[PDB]
Amino acid sequence: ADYQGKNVVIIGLGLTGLSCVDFFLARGVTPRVMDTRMTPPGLDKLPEAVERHTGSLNDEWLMAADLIVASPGIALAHPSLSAAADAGIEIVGDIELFCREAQAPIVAITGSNGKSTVTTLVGEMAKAAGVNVGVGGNIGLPALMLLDDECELYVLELSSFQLETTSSLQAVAATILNVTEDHMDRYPFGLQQYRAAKLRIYENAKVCVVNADDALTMPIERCVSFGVNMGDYHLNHETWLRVKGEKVLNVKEMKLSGQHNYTNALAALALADAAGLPRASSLKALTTFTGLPHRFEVVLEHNGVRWINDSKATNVGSTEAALNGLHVDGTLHLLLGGDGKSADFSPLARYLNGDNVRLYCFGRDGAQLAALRPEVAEQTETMEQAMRLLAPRVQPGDMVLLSPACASLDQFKNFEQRGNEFARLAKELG
Ligand SMILES: CC(=O)N[C@H]1[C@@H](OP(=O)(O)OP(=O)(O)OC[C@H]2O[C@@H](n3ccc(=O)[nH]c3=O)[C@H](O)[C@@H]2O)O[C@H](CO)[C@@H](O)[C@@H]1O[C@H](C)C(=O)N[C@@H](C)C(=O)O
Ligand SMILES: Nc1ncnc2c1ncn2[C@@H]1O[C@H](COP(=O)(O)OP(=O)(O)O)[C@@H](O)[C@H]1O
Ligand SMILES: [Mn+2]
C-alpha cells in the first residue's frame, strides 16, 4: 500500500506503537503518536523528531487524520476512536499494515489459550524443513519487524484485539484454537462479541482449522478439524497423534505433555500441512520442541519440591488446564491474582476442594480469588509477599504453582517479569 503525504496518527506508545513509528519513518512518512497514559513505557525510545501527545487521546489529531493506526491495547470503543470511526476515518492496526505488505504466505493463530505454543511449534516445523520463517505478532515480536524479502513463511500469533482492526488477512492456514471467557473488560457484549473478533481470522483463509471439541471455534468447503476423540487430526489411545486414522507420532517422543499440548501439536501439524510443509520434518520438530518459558515451566526442583512458573496462565481456561488432573504428592501452594479482566473465576473452585490445596491470592483482584475457597486462602498485596508467606510451609512432595488466571499489568511490566520474579524468589526461598 502507499502512505506518502498522508496524515498518519498512531495510538499507543508501547511495543506496537514504536514498531509502527519505525515502519512509517522508513517509508518517508512522519506519523504523530498519542497514548492515554501519561508516562507510557515507550516514551523514552521514541525518535526525537516524532510529535507525541500523552495523558489522553487528542481529538484534534484524530479528527484530522487520513489514517489512524490503533495499537491492540486501545479499545475501538474508546469514545475518541468511536467518533473518528463515525466520521469515516480509516482505522487499522499493525497486523493490518503487515498483511498489506507481506509477500510470503501467512499462518495465523488465535484462540483463548495455546496461541504462543502453536505459533512456536509451526515455526519449528518450518525451520526443520529449512524454510526461512518469520515468527511474531502477539507472541511478542511486533509483526512489522518481521517484514523481510528473504522470508518464506510468516507465522503470526494474533490476539482478538489485533483481529478487530484487521481486514486484509488472507491466511494460507488459520485457526481459532479455543474460545473461553477472557478479556471481558474489553468486550461489553460478552463472550459472543469476543468470539466474533476471533472469527475474523478465517475470512479469506485458504484452509481453516477448527477445534472439533469447541463449537465456538467454528465459522460459517469445510474446515479441517483437530480434536481428542474426533477430528481430521485426533488422538489415539500410551497416546498417539493421528491424521484421519493413521498414526503419525507416539507422544512419548514429544518433550511437552498434557492433553491440551497434544491437541496443540495436532493443530500445529494441521496448519503446517496446510502451508505445504513436509510432514516428516514437521514431526521431527514436534520431538525437539521443549516448551516456552512461563508456560507451565518448572523453574526449580529442589528438596522434593517443584516450583512451577505458569505466569502465562492469564485466564480461567489456562489455570484450569494446569489444575485439571494435576498430580501433587503433598500440598499444592497455588498463587492466584493480578488483573482479572472481569473474569468469573468460579469455574476454578471445583478444582480447589480437599485437604492438600493452599491458595495465596494477590494483586488487584486478589480478594476475588481468595473468595473461591476462603478457608484455605491467604491474601497479600504482592506476589513476593505471598511467596515469602508460603515458603516456610513448603514440605517435600509439595508443588508451588504460579498459575495466576490473571493479566500482570496491574503490578508488572509484563507477564515475563512476573514469571522471572517468581523464578528468582523460588531460587531464593526453595
Ligand atoms: C495488550 C496487548 O495487546 N499487548 C500486546 C502489544 O503490546 P504493546 O506494548 O504494543 O501493548 P499496547 O497496545 O501498547 O497496550 C499495552 C497497555 O497499555 C495500555 N494502553 C495502551 C494504549 C493507550 O493509549 N492507553 C493505554 O492505557 C493498554 O490498555 C494496554 O493494556 O503488542 C505486542 C506485539 O504484538 C504483543 O506481544 C503484546 O502482547 C501481550 C503479551 C498481551 O498481553 N497481549 C494480550 C492481548 C493477551 O495475550 O491476552
Ligand atoms: N490448548 C490449550 N487450552 C488451555 N490452556 C492451554 C492450552 N495450551 C496451553 N495452555 C496454557 O495456556 C497458557 C498460555 O499458553 P500459550 O501457549 O502462551 O497461549 P496464549 O499465547 O494464547 O496465551 C499457559 O498457562 C499454558 O499451559
Ligand atoms: Mn489474551
Swiss-Prot record:
Belongs to the MurCDEF family. GO terms for biological process: cell division; cell wall organization; peptidoglycan biosynthetic process; regulation of cell shape. It comes from Escherichia coli (strain K12). GO terms for molecular function: ATP binding; identical protein binding; UDP-N-acetylmuramoylalanine-D-glutamate ligase activity. SUPFAM superfamilies: MurCD N-terminal domain, MurD-like peptide ligases, catalytic domain, MurD-like peptide ligases, peptide-binding domain. GO terms for cellular component: cytoplasm. Keywords: ATP-binding, Cell cycle, Cell division, Cell shape, Cell wall biogenesis/degradation, Cytoplasm, Ligase, Nucleotide-binding, Peptidoglycan synthesis. It is an enzyme of class 6 (ligase). Its main location: cytoplasm. Transmembrane segments: none annotated. Cell wall formation. Catalyzes the addition of glutamate to the nucleotide precursor UDP-N-acetylmuramoyl-L-alanine (UMA). Optimum pH is 9.0. The keyword Cell division applies. The lineage of its organism: Bacteria, Pseudomonadati, Pseudomonadota, Gammaproteobacteria, Enterobacterales. It is found in: Cytoplasm. InterPro entries: Mur-like_cat_sf, Mur_ligase_C, Mur_ligase_C_dom_sf, Mur_ligase_cen, MurD. ATP binds at residues 111-117. It catalyses: UDP-N-acetyl-alpha-D-muramoyl-L-alanine + D-glutamate + ATP = UDP-N-acetyl-alpha-D-muramoyl-L-alanyl-D-glutamate + ADP + phosphate + H(+). The gene is murD. This is UDP-N-acetylmuramoylalanine--D-glutamate ligase. Its EC number is 6.3.2.9. NCBIfam families: murD (TIGR01087). Disulfide bonds: none annotated. Pathway: Cell wall biogenesis; peptidoglycan biosynthesis. It comes from the Bacteria. Its cofactor is Mg(2+). Pfam families: Mur_ligase_C (PF02875), Mur_ligase_M (PF08245), MurD-like_N (PF21799).
